[PDB]
Amino acid sequence: NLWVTVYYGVPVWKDAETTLFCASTDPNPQEIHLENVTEEFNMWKNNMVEQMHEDIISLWDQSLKPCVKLTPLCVGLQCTNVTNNITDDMRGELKNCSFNATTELRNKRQKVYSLFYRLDIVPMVDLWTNYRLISCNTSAITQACPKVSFEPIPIHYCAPAGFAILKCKDKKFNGTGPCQNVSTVQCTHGIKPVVSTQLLLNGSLAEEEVIIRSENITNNAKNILVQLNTSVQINCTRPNNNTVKSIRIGPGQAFYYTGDIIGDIRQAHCNVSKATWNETLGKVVKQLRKHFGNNTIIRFAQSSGGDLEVTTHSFNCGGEFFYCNTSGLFNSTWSITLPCRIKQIINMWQRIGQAMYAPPIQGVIRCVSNITGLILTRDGGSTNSTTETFRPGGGDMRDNWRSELYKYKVVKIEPLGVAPTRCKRR
Amino acid sequence: ENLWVTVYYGVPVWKDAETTLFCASEIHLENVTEEFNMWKNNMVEQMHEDIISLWDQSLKPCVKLTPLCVGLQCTNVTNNITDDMRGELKNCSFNATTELRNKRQKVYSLFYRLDIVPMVDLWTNYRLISCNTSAITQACPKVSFEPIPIHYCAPAGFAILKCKDKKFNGTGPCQNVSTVQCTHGIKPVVSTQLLLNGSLAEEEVIIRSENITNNAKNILVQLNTSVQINCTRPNNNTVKSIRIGPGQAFYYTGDIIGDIRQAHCNVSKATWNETLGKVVKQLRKHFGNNTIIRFAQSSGGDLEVTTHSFNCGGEFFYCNTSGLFNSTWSITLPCRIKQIINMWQRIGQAMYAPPIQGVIRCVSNITGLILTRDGGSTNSTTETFRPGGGDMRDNWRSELYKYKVVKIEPLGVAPTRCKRR
Amino acid sequence: SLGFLGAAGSTMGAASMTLTVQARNLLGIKQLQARVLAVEHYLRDQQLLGIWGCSGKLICCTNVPWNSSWSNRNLSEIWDNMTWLQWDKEISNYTQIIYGLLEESQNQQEKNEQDLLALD
Amino acid sequence: GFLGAAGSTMGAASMTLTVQARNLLSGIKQLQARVLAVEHYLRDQQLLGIWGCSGKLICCTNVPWNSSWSNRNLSEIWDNMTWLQWDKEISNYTQIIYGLLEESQNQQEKNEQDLLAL
Amino acid sequence: SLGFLGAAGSTMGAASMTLTVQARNLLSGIKQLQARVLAVEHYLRDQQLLGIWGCSGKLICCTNVPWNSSWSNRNLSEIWDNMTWLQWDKEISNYTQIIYGLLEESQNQQEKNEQDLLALD
Ligand SMILES: *[C@@H]1O[C@H](CO)[C@@H](O[C@@H]2O[C@H](CO)[C@@H](O[C@@H]3O[C@H](CO)[C@@H](O)[C@H](O)[C@@H]3O)[C@H](O)[C@H]2NC(C)=O)[C@H](O)[C@H]1NC(C)=O
Ligand SMILES: *[C@@H]1O[C@H](CO)[C@@H](O[C@@H]2O[C@H](CO)[C@@H](O)[C@H](O)[C@H]2NC(C)=O)[C@H](O)[C@H]1NC(C)=O
Ligand SMILES: *[C@@H]1O[C@H](CO)[C@@H](O[C@@H]2O[C@H](CO)[C@@H](O)[C@H](O)[C@H]2NC(C)=O)[C@H](O)[C@H]1NC(C)=O
Ligand SMILES: *[C@@H]1O[C@H](CO)[C@@H](O[C@@H]2O[C@H](CO)[C@@H](O)[C@H](O)[C@H]2NC(C)=O)[C@H](O)[C@H]1NC(C)=O
Ligand SMILES: *[C@@H]1O[C@H](CO)[C@@H](O)[C@H](O)[C@H]1NC(C)=O
Ligand SMILES: *[C@@H]1O[C@H](CO)[C@@H](O)[C@H](O)[C@H]1NC(C)=O
Ligand SMILES: *[C@@H]1O[C@H](CO)[C@@H](O)[C@H](O)[C@H]1NC(C)=O
Ligand SMILES: *[C@@H]1O[C@H](CO)[C@@H](O)[C@H](O)[C@H]1NC(C)=O
Ligand SMILES: *[C@@H]1O[C@H](CO)[C@@H](O)[C@H](O)[C@H]1NC(C)=O
Ligand SMILES: *[C@@H]1O[C@H](CO)[C@@H](O)[C@H](O)[C@H]1NC(C)=O
Ligand SMILES: *[C@@H]1O[C@H](CO)[C@@H](O)[C@H](O)[C@H]1NC(C)=O
Ligand SMILES: *[C@@H]1O[C@H](CO)[C@@H](O)[C@H](O)[C@H]1NC(C)=O
Ligand SMILES: *[C@@H]1O[C@H](CO)[C@@H](O)[C@H](O)[C@H]1NC(C)=O
Ligand SMILES: *[C@@H]1O[C@H](CO)[C@@H](O)[C@H](O)[C@H]1NC(C)=O
Ligand SMILES: *[C@@H]1O[C@H](CO)[C@@H](O)[C@H](O)[C@H]1NC(C)=O
Ligand SMILES: *[C@@H]1O[C@H](CO)[C@@H](O)[C@H](O)[C@H]1NC(C)=O
Ligand SMILES: *[C@@H]1O[C@H](CO)[C@@H](O)[C@H](O)[C@H]1NC(C)=O
Ligand SMILES: *[C@@H]1O[C@H](CO)[C@@H](O)[C@H](O)[C@H]1NC(C)=O
Ligand SMILES: *[C@@H]1O[C@H](CO)[C@@H](O)[C@H](O)[C@H]1NC(C)=O
Ligand SMILES: *[C@@H]1O[C@H](CO)[C@@H](O)[C@H](O)[C@H]1NC(C)=O
Ligand SMILES: *[C@@H]1O[C@H](CO)[C@@H](O)[C@H](O)[C@H]1NC(C)=O
Ligand SMILES: *[C@@H]1O[C@H](CO)[C@@H](O)[C@H](O)[C@H]1NC(C)=O
Ligand SMILES: *[C@@H]1O[C@H](CO)[C@@H](O)[C@H](O)[C@H]1NC(C)=O
Ligand SMILES: *[C@@H]1O[C@H](CO)[C@@H](O)[C@H](O)[C@H]1NC(C)=O
Ligand SMILES: *[C@@H]1O[C@H](CO)[C@@H](O)[C@H](O)[C@H]1NC(C)=O
Ligand SMILES: *[C@@H]1O[C@H](CO)[C@@H](O)[C@H](O)[C@H]1NC(C)=O
Ligand SMILES: *[C@@H]1O[C@H](CO)[C@@H](O)[C@H](O)[C@H]1NC(C)=O
Ligand SMILES: *[C@@H]1O[C@H](CO)[C@@H](O)[C@H](O)[C@H]1NC(C)=O
Ligand SMILES: *[C@@H]1O[C@H](CO)[C@@H](O)[C@H](O)[C@H]1NC(C)=O
Ligand SMILES: *[C@@H]1O[C@H](CO)[C@@H](O)[C@H](O)[C@H]1NC(C)=O
Ligand SMILES: *[C@@H]1O[C@H](CO)[C@@H](O)[C@H](O)[C@H]1NC(C)=O
Ligand SMILES: *[C@@H]1O[C@H](CO)[C@@H](O)[C@H](O)[C@H]1NC(C)=O
Ligand SMILES: *[C@@H]1O[C@H](CO)[C@@H](O)[C@H](O)[C@H]1NC(C)=O
Ligand SMILES: *[C@@H]1O[C@H](CO)[C@@H](O)[C@H](O)[C@H]1NC(C)=O
Ligand SMILES: *[C@@H]1O[C@H](CO)[C@@H](O)[C@H](O)[C@H]1NC(C)=O
Numbered sequence A: 001n002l003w004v005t006v007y008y009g010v011p012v013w014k015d016a017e018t019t020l021f022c023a024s025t026d027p028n029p030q031e032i033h034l035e036n037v038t039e040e041f042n043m044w045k046n047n048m049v050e051q052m053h054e055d056i057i058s059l060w061d062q063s064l065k066p067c068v069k070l071t072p073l074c075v076g077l078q079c080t081n082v083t084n085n086i087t088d089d090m091r092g093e094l095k096n097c098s099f100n101a102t103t104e105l106r107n108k109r110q111k112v113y114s115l116f117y118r119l120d121i122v123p124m125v126d127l128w129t130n131y132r133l134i135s136c137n138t139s140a141i142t143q144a145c146p147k148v149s150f151e152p153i154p155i156h157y158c159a160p161a162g163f164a165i166l167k168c169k170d171k172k173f174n175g176t177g178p179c180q181n182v183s184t185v186q187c188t189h190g191i192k193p194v195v196s197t198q199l200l201l202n203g204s205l206a207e208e209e210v211i212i213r214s215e216n217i218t219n220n221a222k223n224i225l226v227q228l229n230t231s232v233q234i235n236c237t238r239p240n241n242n243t244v245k246s247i248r249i250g251p252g253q254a255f256y257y258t259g260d261i262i263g264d265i266r267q268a269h270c271n272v273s274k275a276t277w278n279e280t281l282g283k284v285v286k287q288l289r290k291h292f293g294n295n296t297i298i299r300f301a302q303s304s305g306g307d308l309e310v311t312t313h314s315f316n317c318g319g320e321f322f323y324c325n326t327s328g329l330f331n332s333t334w335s336i337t338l339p340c341r342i343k344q345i346i347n348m349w350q351r352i353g354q355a356m357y358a359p360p361i362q363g364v365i366r367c368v369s370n371i372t373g374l375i376l377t378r379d380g381g382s383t384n385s386t387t388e389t390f391r392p393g394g395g396d397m398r399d400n401w402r403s404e405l406y407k408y409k410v411v412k413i414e415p416l417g418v419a420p421t422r423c424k425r426r
Numbered sequence B: 001e002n003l004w005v006t007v008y009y010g011v012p013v014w015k016d017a018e019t020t021l022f023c024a025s026e027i028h029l030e031n032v033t034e035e036f037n038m039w040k041n042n043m044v045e046q047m048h049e050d051i052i053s054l055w056d057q058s059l060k061p062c063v064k065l066t067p068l069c070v071g072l073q074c075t076n077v078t079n080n081i082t083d084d085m086r087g088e089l090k091n092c093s094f095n096a097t098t099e100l101r102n103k104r105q106k107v108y109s110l111f112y113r114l115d116i117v118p119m120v121d122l123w124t125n126y127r128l129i130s131c132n133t134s135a136i137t138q139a140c141p142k143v144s145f146e147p148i149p150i151h152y153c154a155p156a157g158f159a160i161l162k163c164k165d166k167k168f169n170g171t172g173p174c175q176n177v178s179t180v181q182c183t184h185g186i187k188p189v190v191s192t193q194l195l196l197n198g199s200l201a202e203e204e205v206i207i208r209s210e211n212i213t214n215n216a217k218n219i220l221v222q223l224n225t226s227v228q229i230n231c232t233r234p235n236n237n238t239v240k241s242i243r244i245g246p247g248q249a250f251y252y253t254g255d256i257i258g259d260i261r262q263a264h265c266n267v268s269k270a271t272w273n274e275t276l277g278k279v280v281k282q283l284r285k286h287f288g289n290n291t292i293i294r295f296a297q298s299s300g301g302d303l304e305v306t307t308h309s310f311n312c313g314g315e316f317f318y319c320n321t322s323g324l325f326n327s328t329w330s331i332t333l334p335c336r337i338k339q340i341i342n343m344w345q346r347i348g349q350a351m352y353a354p355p356i357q358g359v360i361r362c363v364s365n366i367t368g369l370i371l372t373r374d375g376g377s378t379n380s381t382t383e384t385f386r387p388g389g390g391d392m393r394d395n396w397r398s399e400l401y402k403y404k405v406v407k408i409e410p411l412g413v414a415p416t417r418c419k420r421r
Numbered sequence C: 001s002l003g004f005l006g007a008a009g010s011t012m013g014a015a016s017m018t019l020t021v022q023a024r025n026l027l028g029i030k031q032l033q034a035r036v037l038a039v040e041h042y043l044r045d046q047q048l049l050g051i052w053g054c055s056g057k058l059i060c061c062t063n064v065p066w067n068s069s070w071s072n073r074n075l076s077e078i079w080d081n082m083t084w085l086q087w088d089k090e091i092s093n094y095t096q097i098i099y100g101l102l103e104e105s106q107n108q109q110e111k112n113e114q115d116l117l118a119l120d
Numbered sequence D: 001g002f003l004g005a006a007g008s009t010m011g012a013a014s015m016t017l018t019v020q021a022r023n024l025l026s027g028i029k030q031l032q033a034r035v036l037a038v039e040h041y042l043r044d045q046q047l048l049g050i051w052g053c054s055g056k057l058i059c060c061t062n063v064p065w066n067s068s069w070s071n072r073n074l075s076e077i078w079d080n081m082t083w084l085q086w087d088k089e090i091s092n093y094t095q096i097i098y099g100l101l102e103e104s105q106n107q108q109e110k111n112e113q114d115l116l117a118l
Numbered sequence E: 001s002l003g004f005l006g007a008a009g010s011t012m013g014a015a016s017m018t019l020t021v022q023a024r025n026l027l028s029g030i031k032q033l034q035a036r037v038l039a040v041e042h043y044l045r046d047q048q049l050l051g052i053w054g055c056s057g058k059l060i061c062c063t064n065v066p067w068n069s070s071w072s073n074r075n076l077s078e079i080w081d082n083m084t085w086l087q088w089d090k091e092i093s094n095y096t097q098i099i100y101g102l103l104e105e106s107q108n109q110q111e112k113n114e115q116d117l118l119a120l121d
């Protein structure tokens, strides 16, 4: 009675992993809401996070190729103390280091004197030198081009023809499971590739409430990503009127360094309010209690030691990589100012062999910045769920980008299908 | 009239389009009028970008002269120097590097004054020019820069329309239009004041300019006859080379055998005078029969834009051009030689042209000019033109002006009486 | 008027009215790989329709009868009470048998038409 | 020859559709050019396919001609116009015509689906 | 059943029943993309050439071009039962362009005749 009828253009899809376009090529966005659908999402199996990670690494590596190498500056340094007025907390933090640098001429050196942060130098004992640059015994140092900025620029990931991106609009979406309010887009919204290690800055806020996302909430080896519904503002500054000088080290190689600091030296601090931070932590704890016992005491603590790039909270305020100390922020059991250390020679992500030198920017650097999320890690159930301790632990950078790509899934369109009809060909 | 839409595929229509053309190395269209605009032709922009990219890719895998940015002790040349060549050449000495890293060497060499700059020192006198701005790379002595005809070809689905009209001024409708897939062989000849080894007009000198009333734009003059230019550097240069590193080689002028004379380029007086007569006859069509036309010297810039650059055999001849123009309506024109050149109009890069052995003598066909109008608002009817410089696109726009890239739109609709059942 | 995949959650007998909306939306190294793979997927689907004798059609009726072992449902529940996604899931790993039957049926049809057109 | 009929009248140019065809299909820039030509060819073939005109160069349809698109008679259209002038004249309605063509095919297959269901 | 080219050494009649098996195998870092683009271009040129002849969508296409005895004077029994496609293709070398031109012209005339027949009220 019934016959096979072939249809082409069937609105069905399968989960798939394909290559996405990076648009910024400004797209004309479209969004089609899908009525009466349910789609299973899994933010921790989303290939878009791995592809975004690879794209950011490739763009970063490409940006540093046509730039000045600092190979001739891997020389011994004669470092002494800074003669300006400093406080007790900054004793030994900044050093005045002299060295012999090359010039455009191959057989004519030049004495130089430059201020360096203590974190950027390592002791090395010789008759006339005291320190060397931290990375010169591990890898070449490449100077970032001063014409190229670091500041995140929102980008869009776009599926190729034959593929589509599904967006989950459900409130209180925990990152996995079914989603009912699902729409189809060709390109994602503008996602800022913001680089941070403990707090998520300039990201997306939750529509309804604080959302706690974990691949396995009972596995203490996985990170917990907390998205806030309200932002908490961070005011960061390096209160030092830095005077930047430069020297020519090769035929086309110009090197930039700290020349001097005008006036007294004061430390580099980020201010977060106390009323809103206390409300934020109360909300986070209230949401945590829904994944643990209702009478379990939840306490926050300082991060563990080891690997300064992880133990501190990074930004890219101005053009200078801060590294703040959240120990005074999470020291509570359920304003505020954070001493931030400055480095210039940065090994970003967890790579070894590619060292980038961030040149200083003249003047003061002050930036205000929305905190939109947190990365928390649990210490472990050593008390049998009597008391739980959470720390602002670090993790791979994928966790920050996943915190934006959790709403998107890539699906492959399958235009063909078959179905019974009474239609017989002849 | 009971008409129905009929869909036709293979419709002979097109749209103006900008697409990517590829390099390589003719169907007449009757009753077709096509509007051309040589100053909106994206083939010139693509040719410019392609030549820049090809040049940079050819220069990249070559010997760098970074170790040669050292101080030099330069003295006067001890050969017989004529009155015009005094101070143009220096006998410089510079210690250099060697295949090994623990040794050095001494390298006497003969440099042009344009290639070195005075420095502030007590022991050395000069530096190589641009060592304080960019790295200098030597252009591999195998590869050549000799112009080779390049054909620009459209992708499938696109076509190139060629205007065959006589007295075509670069814009407006063309009546004689042909379709090609690839252009003819266009030589990427590099020059500034005069256009060499190009095509000729069939009937008369053609004056092509954008908004000719605006004197800020350049005027491209295409001749219908050629003017033979005979350039030479009468000097038997003996070239030596040094290792300066494993697998590296630097070439320099060792000495000059015989007397030293300047680079003289000869231009026939009568042919050039007739050419300028033709140019003023055509300019008067745009300025008035009673307008006096003066051809003055180029000014307002450095050696790169105020002289006639002209690769010949390898060495770049910056000819003064004072013996041309210089009039109100054999010429042994002096020329300067420069070795550390910066082609295009960039800054971040520099190229060293290795000297070529023996006497250099070329014979080139002047097929066009680039002129600039002095301007002013006096209503004096005494317009003055100079052989001003410009972007390199104006040389490549002196060709590729009759070609337009169009996208084929084979799909179309039309009414017919045909109804599908 | 619903847009691309707008009918994806609608019933099969309603979503079948929007096949042209889906069809029109099917068309540096990474960008070329994405464009070439989209072209290859389109061409494989078009060749597969051509093998079945359905070239140039979006709704193509065939001569393969429906087996009750593939889906023991009536037309009302298939077309009016379920979506194409649920149908596609229901007949997963039965489509290769259907495709083979369609290929063989078209080969037999082409031979029969050639023999009919060979009669004087 | 290719585009030789571009200056001919449409009645004469419509007989050279196979001459205009075949010229649509035949280091990274050359590969991008090839992919672009293939993409445009496939977009045009899909656009014909969704109209029920697949495999044909002259395809008759069931969409009546609207006098608001062009009020010329067939003698003037086919004997006194080239395809370029015609394309310029009706460009502002081309997409509207395409939409109507698509709609006709959407109905046509459904009717055929019903006729074969008897 | 016989595989991709299993019928290559079989007779033309037997090999004509395996067209879909070979048709499926025509479609399925810079040099890999060049290879893929070349495969796509060859497929599309063949599909276009069939479309010009009015054979689009069919693997066996009957036409209106009579066979010329100057191309091959073998009878159907010898061509289809005692000859392979490779030997036949060798036999009709230097004649395929004439056949292709005749097929193109015949389809153009067929399209004009169909358009005129459909223009009768
Ligand atoms: C999060 O977003 C905020 C808001 O965009 C970022 O702060 C803003 O950053 C821009 C770009 O650096 C600042 O513009 C700069 O201003 C200085 C002023 O001297 C100027 O010299 C630079 O050339 C540039 O124009 C802008 O001032 C700043 N605005 C505010 C209100 O903070 C912030 O950097 C982002 N945070 C992260 C971690 O990406
Ligand atoms: C860093 O050290 C340099 C010397 O290496 C200091 O430069 C000297 O500063 C004194 C200040 O009284 C001057 O009198 C000298 O003439 C300077 N010498 C040179 C060579 O510049 C520099 O001031 C030090 N900077 C800081 C911040 O302590
Ligand atoms: C920078 O260069 C100066 C050049 O004078 C170095 O000073 C001399 O160093 C040698 C050993 O390299 C000593 O024997 C001399 O006595 C030094 N001269 C003076 C006046 O102190 C200086 O040590 C170099 N600095 C660094 C950090 O390498
Ligand atoms: C690189 O060196 C050249 C040569 O000295 C500089 O160019 C000269 O700059 C002076 C500046 O006082 C001018 O007066 C001269 O006319 C220039 N001469 C030439 C031949 O160019 C150039 O400015 C230097 N560039 C840098 C970045 O230091
Ligand atoms: C710098 O001063 C601090 C105390 O002000 C002292 O502890 C430190 O050792 C000094 N460093 C040097 C290099 O003199
Ligand atoms: C480079 O020096 C640091 C100084 O502590 C040391 O930890 C590191 O291991 C050194 N690198 C290598 C490759 O040994
Ligand atoms: C998200 O919520 C759904 C609701 O049923 C639950 O099944 C799922 O396990 C949750 N996932 C996580 C990661 O909390
Ligand atoms: C889905 O989310 C959007 C977000 O604004 C909302 O407007 C829409 O009503 C939601 N859909 C449903 C079915 O609730
Ligand atoms: C954020 O969530 C808290 C949860 O108590 C709620 O009180 C507050 O109003 C929410 N804010 C917004 C802007 O949704
Ligand atoms: C993962 O989650 C399940 C859910 O109950 C839990 O039983 C399991 O222990 C978790 N994995 C680990 C490694 O703890
Ligand atoms: C500092 O922080 C508060 C709260 O985070 C914010 O409202 C205020 O605008 C900031 N002020 C400055 C000067 O950065
Ligand atoms: C941070 O707080 C300190 C405390 O006094 C203040 O001096 C500084 O100005 C604050 N920073 C900003 C950016 O407002
Ligand atoms: C942050 O400050 C606390 C204050 O006790 C200190 O113990 C901790 O080590 C600091 N963080 C880092 C990364 O040094
Ligand atoms: C730093 O001091 C200099 C003194 O000349 C002044 O011109 C400059 O504006 C100051 N910069 C800042 C950021 O205070
Ligand atoms: C930060 O939060 C405030 C709160 O309203 C918002 O208006 C502002 O635009 C946010 N800034 C950024 C950079 O996201
Ligand atoms: C070299 O020639 C220049 C030309 O002016 C002259 O000034 C200079 O004195 C001459 N030097 C010697 C050593 O002859
Ligand atoms: C070029 O010739 C056309 C002929 O129609 C004319 O309209 C146009 O103004 C001319 N332009 C120049 C710059 O001579
Ligand atoms: C077009 O130019 C060509 C160039 O040789 C010439 O042969 C032909 O006669 C010209 N046709 C017209 C119509 O001017
Ligand atoms: C070139 O054009 C001029 C117009 O002034 C004419 O007199 C001359 O004879 C032409 N030459 C040729 C070879 O046609
Ligand atoms: C041409 O130049 C004149 C100079 O006054 C100016 O007024 C006019 O707008 C210009 N036209 C164009 C098209 O550039
Ligand atoms: C140069 O012109 C002469 C006659 O003017 C001609 O014979 C010769 O072929 C031309 N050469 C080139 C390269 O244009
Ligand atoms: C330069 O001087 C050296 C000194 O020995 C001499 O050998 C060489 O020939 C001289 N070169 C010129 C060009 O005068
Ligand atoms: C150029 O003309 C001069 C006239 O004195 C002559 O001596 C010289 O040899 C000529 N050179 C060439 C290359 O024609
Ligand atoms: C240029 O040189 C050639 C060489 O044969 C000669 O025939 C011609 O007359 C010369 N022309 C001039 C203007 O010197
Ligand atoms: C100049 O005189 C000639 C003589 O015939 C004439 O044809 C031309 O139009 C005149 N031009 C002007 C600008 O007066
Ligand atoms: C060209 O020669 C004249 C002769 O007086 C001279 O004034 C002019 O400066 C020369 N050109 C250049 C670019 O030096
Ligand atoms: C240029 O013209 C002036 C005008 O009198 C003349 O004196 C001078 O000699 C001329 N120079 C050249 C190089 O033609
Ligand atoms: C230059 O002089 C050398 C001396 O041996 C000779 O061999 C060579 O041929 C000369 N060059 C020319 C171009 O005559
Ligand atoms: C969703 O289901 C309801 C239930 O009747 C139906 O009315 C509605 O049309 C469905 N949505 C779509 C897009 O068809
Ligand atoms: C298909 O139908 C036949 C009878 O028509 C039956 O024997 C066969 O088992 C069915 N297919 C499957 C996969 O069961
Ligand atoms: C189709 O089968 C279902 C299964 O129970 C039944 O409920 C429904 O009434 C049937 N419909 C028809 C039209 O037979
Ligand atoms: C075939 O598809 C059905 C559809 O649900 C599924 O249940 C069955 O497991 C599939 N067969 C195999 C072998 O997986
Ligand atoms: C161009 O128009 C003339 C007018 O008589 C006509 O004879 C000729 O055939 C037309 N050209 C073409 C290619 O049809
Ligand atoms: C023809 O077009 C007009 C508007 O362009 C429209 O109102 C009219 O309905 C169309 N004709 C038909 C028969 O629908
Ligand atoms: C077509 O319309 C034009 C209007 O200009 C008219 O002259 C011509 O005779 C008409 N043709 C027919 C066949 O009615």
Ligand SMILES: *[C@@H]1O[C@H](CO)[C@@H](O)[C@H](O)[C@H]1NC(C)=O
Pocket: D088, D089, D090, D091, D092
């Ligand atoms: C098409 O529309 C544009 C503006 O919308 C108008 O300028 C043009 O003349 C129109 N074309 C026709 C053929 O009427």
Ligand SMILES: *[C@@H]1O[C@H](CO)[C@@H](O)[C@H](O)[C@H]1NC(C)=O
Pocket: E006, E007, E009, E010, E011, E014
């Ligand atoms: C090969 O030839 C033999 C001849 O006896 C035939 O039987 C056999 O079928 C042929 N092979 C194939 C694959 O058809």
Ligand SMILES: *[C@@H]1O[C@H](CO)[C@@H](O)[C@H](O)[C@H]1NC(C)=O
Pocket: E066, E067, E068, E069, E070
């Ligand atoms: C076969 O080809 C010959 C070649 O001239 C031709 O004369 C003959 O008419 C052709 N046969 C048929 C039936 O057309």
Ligand SMILES: *[C@@H]1O[C@H](CO)[C@@H](O)[C@H](O)[C@H]1NC(C)=O
Pocket: E074, E075, E077, E078
């Ligand atoms: C076909 O031709 C061959 C060779 O002339 C002959 O042996 C055979 O019998 C012929 N067959 C038929 C059916 O005519």
Ligand SMILES: *[C@@H]1O[C@H](CO)[C@@H](O)[C@H](O)[C@H]1NC(C)=O
Pocket: E090, E091, E092, E093, E094
């Ligand atoms: C085709 O032409 C070539 C040219 O020499 C010839 O060798 C070959 O035999 C011809 N083909 C046939 C089937 O005769």
